[PDB]
């Protein structure tokens, strides 16, 4: 018995249906065999102790999910999911992790197995603080986020929530995995967009921390206040407007 919530109800059918849905509509991944994807996903955590999952467990899934995305148009984000995703619906050549097949399969879901059975545990799954860091969910996100960040080049963008305490959180997935896997051999600049909830938030101590982390990797840093998320989406859609 673990402290975290159990595997999401109907997780196998949900993952399969998301794969079918994504692959039948996104032409770049039409080749994918969704039954193979599920078998590979399931094989990562079934019949395994859910505190000893490795990235290698997910390698067969990563391979089936291979997707040659444009390196220069990646939008990272942290604790501002809905707006980050709205953004890539407007500026459609850009994408978030969850716009890729693998990110889309797993978004908002929970899953784990048991070491002594081939069953999915719907009762409970490990909480990353209270039980163990190396669980099926945490290790998945850590594997795909690292690879996504490693794929990035040129100017990489990150959306951050400026209304919260710790605009940049070094303990988030962005703060602990993604930012440390931006390769300086091909990423030249990280641009931060701090979103407001109704001052200059690019001066906040946590943005200076991010700037410092980034400088040390030999990557440039820009930061921008987005005061009016509504006008920002409008102007990205139609930059010819005299209001922008």
């Amino acid at each position, epitope marked *: 018995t673990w402290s975290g919530p159990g595997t999401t109800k109907r997780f196998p059918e949900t993952v399969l249906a998301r794969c079918v849905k994504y692959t039948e509509i996104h032409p770049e991944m039409r080749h994918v065999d969704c039954q193979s994807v599920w078998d590979a996903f399931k094989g990562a955590f079934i019949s395994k102790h859910p505190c000893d999952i490795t990235e290698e467990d997910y390698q067969p899934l990563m391979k089936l999910g291979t997707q040659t995305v444009p390196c*220069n*148009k990646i939008l990272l984000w942290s604790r501002i999911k809905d707006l980050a995703h709205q953004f890539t619906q407007v*500026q459609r*050549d*850009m994408f978030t992790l969850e716009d890729t097949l693998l990110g889309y399969l797993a978004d908002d879901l929970t899953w784990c197995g048991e070491f002594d059975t081939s069953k999915i545990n719907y009762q409970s799954c490990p909480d990353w603080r209270k039980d163990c860091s190396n669980n099926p969910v945490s290790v998945f996100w850590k594997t795909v986020s690292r690879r996504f960040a490693e794929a990035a080049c*040129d*100017v990489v*963008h990150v959306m951050l929530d400026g209304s919260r305490s710790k605009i940049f959180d070094k303990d988030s997935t962005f703060g602990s995995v993604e930012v440390h896997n931006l390769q300086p051999e091909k990423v*030249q*600049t990280l*641009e*931060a*967009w701090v979103i407001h909830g109704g001052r200059d938030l690019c001066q906040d101590p946590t943005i200076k921390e991010l700037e410092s982390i980034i400088s040390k990797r030999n990557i*440039q840093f*820009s*930061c*921008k206040n987005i005061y009016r998320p509504d006008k920002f989406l409008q*102007c*990205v859609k139609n*930059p*010819e407007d005299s209001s*922008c």
Partner: nanobody
Framework: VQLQESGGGLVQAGGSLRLSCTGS????????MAWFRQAPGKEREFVAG????????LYADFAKGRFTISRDNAKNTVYLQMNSLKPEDTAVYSC?????????????????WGQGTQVTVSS
């Protein structure tokens, strides 16, 4: 968008120039902008790019540490500071205005172009 480059000229190896690209007609403050160059018998090649939201910069490997791209929205101008010039920097340098968010390295994805300004570096 009408674009006009200036600031090119003849310099000795090791010298500097500052190119500017001034926009008449429509503003380009919400377009990504790039500098490209084209030597006499060759294809255009990416030199540097700059975004419009946060004005983030991007350089060709040959440009890093020598060239600096910048923009000033009020003046409707993009600048290329070029230091430590070499003979193989000799070319026609042109600015281009793109669309969307990022400054890509592919000339044919840029909508609006200037005529260019000559840069000649003697040995």
């Amino acid at each position: 968008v009408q674009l006009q480059e200036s600031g090119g000229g003849l310099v000795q190896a090791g010298g500097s120039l500052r190119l500017s690209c001034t926009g008449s007609g429509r503003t380009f403050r919400n377009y990504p902008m790039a500098w490209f160059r084209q030597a006499p018998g060759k294809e255009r090649e990416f030199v540097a790019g700059i975004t419009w939201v946060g004005a983030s910069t991007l350089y060709a490997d040959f440009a890093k540490g020598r060239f600096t791209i910048s923009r000033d929205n009020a003046k409707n101008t993009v600048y290329l500071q070029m230091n430590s010039l070499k003979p193989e920097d000799t070319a026609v340098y042109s600015c281009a205005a793109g669309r969307g968010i990022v400054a890509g390295r592919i000339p044919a994805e840029y909508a609006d172009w200037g005529q260019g300004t000559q840069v000649t570096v003697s040995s």
